[PDB]
Amino acid sequence: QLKNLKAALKARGNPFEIKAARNKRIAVGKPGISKQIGEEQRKRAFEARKMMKNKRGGVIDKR
Amino acid sequence: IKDMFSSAMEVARFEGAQIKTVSGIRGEIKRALSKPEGHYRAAFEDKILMSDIVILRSWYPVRVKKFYNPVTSLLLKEKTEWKGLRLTGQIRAAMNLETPSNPDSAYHKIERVERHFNGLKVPKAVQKELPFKSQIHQMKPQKKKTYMAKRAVVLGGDEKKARSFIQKVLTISKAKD
Amino acid sequence: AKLVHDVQKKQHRERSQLTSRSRYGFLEKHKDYVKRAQDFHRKQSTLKV
Amino acid sequence: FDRTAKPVPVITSEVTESLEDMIRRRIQDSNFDDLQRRTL
Amino acid sequence: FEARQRIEEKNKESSDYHAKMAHIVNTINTEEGAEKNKYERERKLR
Amino acid sequence: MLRRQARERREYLYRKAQELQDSQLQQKRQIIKQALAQGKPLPKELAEDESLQKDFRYDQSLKQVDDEYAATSGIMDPRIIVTTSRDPSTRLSQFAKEIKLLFPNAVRLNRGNYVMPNLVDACKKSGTTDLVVLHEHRGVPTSLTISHFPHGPTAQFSLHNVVMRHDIINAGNQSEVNPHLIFDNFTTALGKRVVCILKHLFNAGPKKDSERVITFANRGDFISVRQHVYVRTREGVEIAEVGPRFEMRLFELRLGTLENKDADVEWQLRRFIRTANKKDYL
RNA sequence: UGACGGAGCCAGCGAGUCUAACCUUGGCCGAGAGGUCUUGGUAAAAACUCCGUCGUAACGAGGAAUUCCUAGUAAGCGCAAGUCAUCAGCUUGCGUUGAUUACGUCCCUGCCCUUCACAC
Numbered sequence A: 001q002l003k004n005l006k007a008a009l010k011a012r013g014n015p016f017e018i019k020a021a022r023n024k025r026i027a028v029g030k031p032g033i034s035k036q037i038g039e040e041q042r043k044r045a046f047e048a049r050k051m052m053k054n055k056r057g058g059v060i061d062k063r
Numbered sequence B: 001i002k003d004m005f006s007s008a009m010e011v012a013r014f015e016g017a018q019i020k021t022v023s024g025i026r027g028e029i030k031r032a033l034s035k036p037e038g039h040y041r042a043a044f045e046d047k048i049l050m051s052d053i054v055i056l057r058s059w060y061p062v063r064v065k066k067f068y069n070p071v072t073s074l075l076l077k078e079k080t081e082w083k084g085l086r087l088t089g090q091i092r093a094a095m096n097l098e099t100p101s102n103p104d105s106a107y108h109k110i111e112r113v114e115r116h117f118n119g120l121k122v123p124k125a126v127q128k129e130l131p132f133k134s135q136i137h138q139m140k141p142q143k144k145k146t147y148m149a150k151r152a153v154v155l156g157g158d159e160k161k162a163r164s165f166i167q168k169v170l171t172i173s174k175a176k177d
Numbered sequence C: 001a002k003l004v005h006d007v008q009k010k011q012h013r014e015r016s017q018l019t020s021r022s023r024y025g026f027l028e029k030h031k032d033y034v035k036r037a038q039d040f041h042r043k044q045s046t047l048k049v
Numbered sequence D: 001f002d003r004t005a006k007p008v009p010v011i012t013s014e015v016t017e018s019l020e021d022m023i024r025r026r027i028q029d030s031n032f033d034d035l036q037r038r039t040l
Numbered sequence E: 001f002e003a004r005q006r007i008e009e010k011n012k013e014s015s016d017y018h019a020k021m022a023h024i025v026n027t028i029n030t031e032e033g034a035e036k037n038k039y040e041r042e043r044k045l046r
Numbered sequence F: 001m002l003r004r005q006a007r008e009r010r011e012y013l014y015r016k017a018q019e020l021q022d023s024q025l026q027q028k029r030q031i032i033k034q035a036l037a038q039g040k041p042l043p044k045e046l047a048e049d050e051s052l053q054k055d056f057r058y059d060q061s062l063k064q065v066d067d068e069y070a071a072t073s074g075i076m077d078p079r080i081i082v083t084t085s086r087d088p089s090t091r092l093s094q095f096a097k098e099i100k101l102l103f104p105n106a107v108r109l110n111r112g113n114y115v116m117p118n119l120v121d122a123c124k125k126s127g128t129t130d131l132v133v134l135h136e137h138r139g140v141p142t143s144l145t146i147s148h149f150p151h152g153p154t155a156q157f158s159l160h161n162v163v164m165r166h167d168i169i170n171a172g173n174q175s176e177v178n179p180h181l182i183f184d185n186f187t188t189a190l191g192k193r194v195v196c197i198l199k200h201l202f203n204a205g206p207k208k209d210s211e212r213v214i215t216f217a218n219r220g221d222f223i224s225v226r227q228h229v230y231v232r233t234r235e236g237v238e239i240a241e242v243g244p245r246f247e248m249r250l251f252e253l254r255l256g257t258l259e260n261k262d263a264d265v266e267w268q269l270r271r272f273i274r275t276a277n278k279k280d281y282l
Numbered sequence G: 001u002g003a004c005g006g007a008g009c010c011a012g013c014g015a016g017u018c019u020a021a022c023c024u025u026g027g028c029c030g031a032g033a034g035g036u037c038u039u040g041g042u043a044a045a046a047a048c049u050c051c052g053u054c055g056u057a058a059c060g061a062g063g064a065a066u067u068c069c070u071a072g073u074a075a076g077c078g079c080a081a082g083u084c085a086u087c088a089g090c091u092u093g094c095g096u097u098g099a100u101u102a103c104g105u106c107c108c109u110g111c112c113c114u115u116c117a118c119a120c
Ligand SMILES: [Mg+2]
Pocket: F087, F112, G075
């Protein structure tokens, strides 16, 4: 890996974030990027619920 | 564990949830068993018994009923016979209903038998390779009738009543002490 | 007993085994557990010796 | 309901970026915690 | 995720409560105790 | 040997017992030394102890890595055997190879019907320094135990987020140079003990320009393990992951070889204590 | 290099007063709680050796590519335990039967190292 790494850098001046399958007849996804998004969306939803726990009013915008 | 939940999807929500038994043994919900539905696996700090009941402590919200019945005695004709919502006790009597009860919930006197545990059984492999100082003397039972065992005369009658009594007295004395 | 009502020092009665589970036997409480644990630890200690 | 233990941490992209930065800083400073041959 | 949030919140709440409880216990001991010693010294002087 | 190993362990345990008894006396001598330099008076108990004062004249003449490792710390390169549980799946066999490439001085051994007392005794004959056993679940590594010979400790770990290198396309081959080590956020006394165990699996004295770095980062008791290869650029450092990635959480640590199930427990993970969630030991 | 049946025969781990179903049909006693009986359905050492009999929609041993492996190893067989993490869609131990082929070479592919006599 390193010898390729020097080769790339001298021309210019992390393959573990991609899950790849076997071509039976290739990159399949993004575990790091997908999990971050799926984890944050439930975080803002959890943030929303804790705001809504103890409220009855709310600005009723019908515009 | 069984009968806590109804389907594996329910167990999914409560994985890792804290649990305990009646005895006080704490535990955790590990994972949901694929078969049968609802059954799950839990690991307890010490071995639990079948007779135990495993309990999960949860909290369910309760809401305050919005009931407002101002007393307006002056508007009435009598002014001293205002009557609003009746008590649960009175309501049941008017409808001829029993106070709900659960046979499980009632209390009863509990009598505990003295607890006793079996004697210790050393594995034979360990027992074989023991130092000479500490070798456990396990005296095997005899099955072939010994000749002396077929010879000895046991006094009957007057001695028998006079010997059972000795085993009677000494049993009282040790228990007294 | 200083500044304590006799109502505070009220006996809390102990529950019993459910009838649906009556076959299995007596419901183990904390006291009867402690006896089970102590005896087991006493025996294992001798084996380790 | 109560939970007994923290769930095992998840490896997000932000976590890797934080972990990478620590390693890069250590190498750049050239301090590593490694066993050193004893003299004599 | 809900498990992760709850334990962090519970631990933080437990941390603040102990600091607050220690805070009130210590300030009472420090200030009030000083006066009690001051009074006792005056009683000894009398 | 068997008589040799038994007596050596007995003396060592006896040395620990006396050292714990000697701990009080050591402090008593430290107080006397400070009193002489400062001129401060001694406490009452030390003043009336004539035996200590007479002993002090001889014991005035007195002055790190852990005891099991102190003998060979930085002298003799570790010898490592990496094995698995019985009838391993292919993935565990693949992962066991990756661990072998991780440690420069490791060798992979097949556990087909090897009995554990035979396995440890065989390794003790051959001078093996460390034995590593990996378990698996449906081709997913789950546990890792590191057993230092001749007399422990045995440290047990559980793996999460395991990502083997075979899961990568066109990864290439690894570099087997003696790699640099990074140990981050190990603070408590137990944490040093784990650093002490993990540090000594590697060969001492990497070259300053060695291009392989292994990092064990503790983050809430979950030791992240990463392997990187770096190229020093004119304006910083650029790194690339070689792998494998995985997270280790200690859950046992015994004063003995992994065979001895009766060995004393130096530390264990208590999960059902009420206050389990609050503190992180490592 | 089968099936069925019978016969002979060989292990090692493991010992918490602790070990383990569900859904029904009815009878009797009991103020109740419940107790007992009755009743149908559903679930839940092996290899080895000897003897006797028969008889040779999907799929019939798995393409390309890719991975692992050197002696009690590969592979086949069952038996236990579930030991604060992991595991029962399974994990870990235990014994039983036990081979072929290499144990040389730096030719290719990678990684690494180097540039106190006598004799050289
Ligand atoms: Mg095999």
